[PDB]
Design a protein around this nucleic acid. Structure first.
Ligand SMILES: [Zn+2]
Length: 56
RNA sequence: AACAGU
């Protein structure tokens, strides 16, 4: 015999389709004030800004 | 994955 399972459907709080992602809420760390594109927890690298060293 | 918003 086994008694273990999950079956329930209930949720509160309004939301279109992106949690409480405020227009001024970072969608990365969840910090309000800065945008994800400006998240201080964003990645960086690899250090080496060299797309194409042309000669002209 | 941590971008759910050019
Ligand atoms: Zn952030």
């Amino acid at each position: 015999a086994t008694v273990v399972s999950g079956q329930k459907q209930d949720r509160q709080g309004g939301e279109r389709r992106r949690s409480q992602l405020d227009r001024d809420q970072c969608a990365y760390c969840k910090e309000k004030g800065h945008w994800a594109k400006d998240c201080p927890k964003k990645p960086r690298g690899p250090r080496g800004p060299r797309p194409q060293t042309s000669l002209l």
